[PDB]
């Protein structure tokens, strides 16, 4: 099964995503709560819009502006760290957040029935007293 969008599937298999698949999809751990610099209006480094993580906002333009044309393509500027491509892959590439402590998905926890408590044969209130400490 290919996600390369050739307009023929005949099949669509939803399923739970592992932590390995989440870190497999991403393009680097976003690790700062800084979205856009207040002065230069450019995306911050390693924040929620970081062009090294997701991609460039200007078409085939590295962030420092060294490489700037389509001849430089598919490469990464060694200074600015942004892979040169189009701007529309910023619609596409996901990032991940690594966690110091693990986390339970609320979609398996606050359900009727709670699938966590039904897999481990436990009360809902057992879970609300475990993973709320």
């Amino acid at each position: 099964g290919a996600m390369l969008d050739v307009n023929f599937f005949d099949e669509l298999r939803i399923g739970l995503a592992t932590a390995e698949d989440i870190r497999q999809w991403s393009y680097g751990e976003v690790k700062k709560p800084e979205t856009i610099n207040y002065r230069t209006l450019k995306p911050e480094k390693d924040g929620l819009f970081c062009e090294k993580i997701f991609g460039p906002t200007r078409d085939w333009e590295c962030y420092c502006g060294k490489y700037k044309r389509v001849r430089f393509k598919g490469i990464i500027c060694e200074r600015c760290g942004v892979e040169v491509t189009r701007a529309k892959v910023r619609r596409e590439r996901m990032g991940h957040i690594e966690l110091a402590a693990p986390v339970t998905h609320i979609w398996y926890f606050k359900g009727v029935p709670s699938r966590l408590g039904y897999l481990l044969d436990l009360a809902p209130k057992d879970l609300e007293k475990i993973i709320y400490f």
Binding site: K31, I97, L99, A101, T104, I106, W107, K110, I131
Partner: protein, 133 residues
């Protein structure tokens, strides 16, 4: 215009999760009493839970005007979710609307059309034809 930025209400949830994870990592590498550490982990857990679905557990996280933040599950469920809206239908190009009047001399396979509107509809066809001529 005038530089009025417009966020998308997920950046605040992502900022809260990012900040709580960074703080938790800092306190873990520092060494802290376990009340503090478990409290930060509980805050991280509630943050992730509200990020997926705000208001699923406890009180919904709101913002200015006490309006609840449109979390990730809010993009799917409800009338403003992706499924219902994508099922609701989209606006289309090459379209148009007008008021109607009776056409008592037209044949049955025929409708009148104002030239000021049909000029706007068939603009690419009319451009191609009058650049061929």
């Amino acid at each position: 215009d005038g530089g009025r930025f417009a966020t998308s209400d997920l950046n605040d949830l992502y900022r809260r999760v990012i900040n709580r994870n960074n703080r938790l990592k800092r306190l873990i590498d520092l060494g802290a009493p376990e009340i503090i550490v478990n409290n930060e982990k509980r805050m991280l857990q509630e943050s992730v839970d509200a990020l997926f679905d705000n208001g699923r557990r406890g009180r919904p996280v709101t913002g200015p005007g006490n309006r609840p933040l449109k979390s990730l599950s809010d993009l799917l469920k409800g009338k403003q979710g992706r499924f219902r809206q994508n099922l609701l239908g989209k606006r289309v190009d090459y379209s148009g609307r007008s008021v109607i009047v009776v056409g008592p001399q037209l044949k049955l396979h025929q409708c009148g059309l104002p030239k000021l509107m049909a000029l706007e509809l068939f603009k690419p066809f009319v451009m191609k034809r009058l650049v061929d001529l």
